């Protein structure tokens, strides 16, 4: 099926308390495999999955140096954005960057993306054609001009379509026993009364990978797909009933939908 | 595999 490799970056400026708190996490589909925390003791990129540990120390050296480069840029960014918006040097601010590359069933490059935020609001983002930028305000318009000058989109497009895809396939092979293997949801049902004549029937969905799943009652109170901690995910959907509308569990790990 | 440091400041 389809596969995606993503990276999430967060830098929170702390007024007069040192370098900004930089935190980076890397995902293959719904499985995190790398981590970097500026306040950590190791000062290096760390694994979060057993299969990525097969990479030698040369891999971890490179990933550590350029995750620090990402923190180096986000630090200048926070000071630059403080000047763009004429904000005080005593306030705490946040930058968030996320990019990645998707492959299809043929494992060839499918879609790419890159989004950048400041204080939780959208700042600048890369279009689906990987050629132009979309600026939210006049400050981001300056960054768009700045990045257009050095043709950053072309360099980013080259990374998303080549290096990002090549290493996505490489991770999928090394972690084939966990990444390419699906985990079907173990479903059960509970029943509870709520009012004088009505009751609530909950359709549970426990321990499944990937997290993509749909749970509805058609011919419905449902919560966020939450992690269990063991790499699998959970979800439940309920409805108050006094069954023409049934619970249909649909998941990639199931050959046919369950009811 | 992180991309190289080709991004300048904002």
């Amino acid at each position: 099926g389809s596969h995606s490799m993503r990276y999430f970056f967060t830098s929170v400026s702390r007024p007069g308390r040192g370098e900004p708190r930089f935190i980076a996490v890397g995902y293959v589909d719904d499985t995190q495999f790398v981590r970097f925390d500026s306040d950590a003791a190791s000062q290096r990129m760390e694994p979060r999955a057993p299969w990525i540990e097969q990479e030698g120390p040369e891999y971890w050296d490179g990933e550590t140096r350029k995750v620090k480069a990402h923190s180096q840029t986000h630090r200048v960014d926070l000071g630059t954005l403080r000047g763009y918006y004429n904000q005080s040097e005593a306030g705490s601010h946040t930058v968030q960057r996320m990019y990645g590359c998707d492959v299809g069933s043929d494992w060839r490059f499918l879609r790419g993306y890159h989004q950048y935020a400041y204080d939780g609001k959208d700042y600048i983002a890369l279009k689906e054609d990987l050629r132009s930028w979309t600026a939210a305000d006049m400050a981001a318009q300056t960054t768009k001009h700045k990045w257009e000058a050095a043709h950053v989109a072309e360099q980013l497009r080259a990374y998303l379509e080549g290096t990002c895809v090549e290493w996505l396939r490489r991770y999928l092979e090394n972690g084939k026993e966990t990444l390419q293997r699906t985990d079907a949801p173990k479903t059960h049902m509970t029943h509870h009364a709520v009012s004088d004549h009505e009751a609530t029937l909950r359709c549970w969905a426990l321990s499944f990978y990937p997290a993509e799943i749909t749970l509805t009652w058609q011919r419905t109170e449902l919560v966020e797909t939450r992690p269990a901690g063991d790499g699998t995910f959970q979800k439940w959907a309920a409805v108050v009933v006094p069954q023409r509308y049934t619970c249909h569990v649909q998941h990639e790990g199931l050959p046919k939908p369950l009811t | 595999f992180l991309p190289s440091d080709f991004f300048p400041s904002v």
Partner: antibody
Amino acid sequence: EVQLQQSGPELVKPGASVKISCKASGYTFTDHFMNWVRQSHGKSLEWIGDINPNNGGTSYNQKFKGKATLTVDKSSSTAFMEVRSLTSDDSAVYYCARRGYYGSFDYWGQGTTLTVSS
Amino acid sequence: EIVMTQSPATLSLSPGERATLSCRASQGVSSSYFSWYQQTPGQAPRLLISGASTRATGIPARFSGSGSGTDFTLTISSLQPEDFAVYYCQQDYNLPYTFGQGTKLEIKR
């Protein structure tokens, strides 16, 4: 060959304005941003601003914002810079520097000496 | 603003020797947005090293650049009579783009 032909030197009384020409040749004029650098006599280089030839978009050094204005003419593949309210502190050599495709200033013009005196 | 500092101001060496110029940035700068320039008195500047290591078109093999973060170094393998000029370092990484004060290479005798 990539060539940046700037305009000749100018002597101007204080308080007037001048516009420097910079003709580009030997490459696709819309593929590269154009910068302007000022160099005072016996001093170092100073970036003024850049121009996007495709749409006229500009970014300026904060000090020069209000002093220099950047325009471009894609028809004649020329970049211009207007320097208003001239003072003796504007007396310097001005260059147009093409921005490299991915960064840096690869090609520079021959420079134009601007002298401001009463 | 990222300040670029070069040292020493004037570096007096003999023709045919190695030359090592330095450039200290007040803030962390990506190596992809660091450049070296050579300028002869009376002539326009010329790009030597782009990307803090990549030589520009036409630049002789005796020139070389290196460094990262806030430290960078220009290296000339053998000093030639043309190589005795003024050298600048810049960063095109954060607005405003800034240069260094420069360093003049003088023939020692």
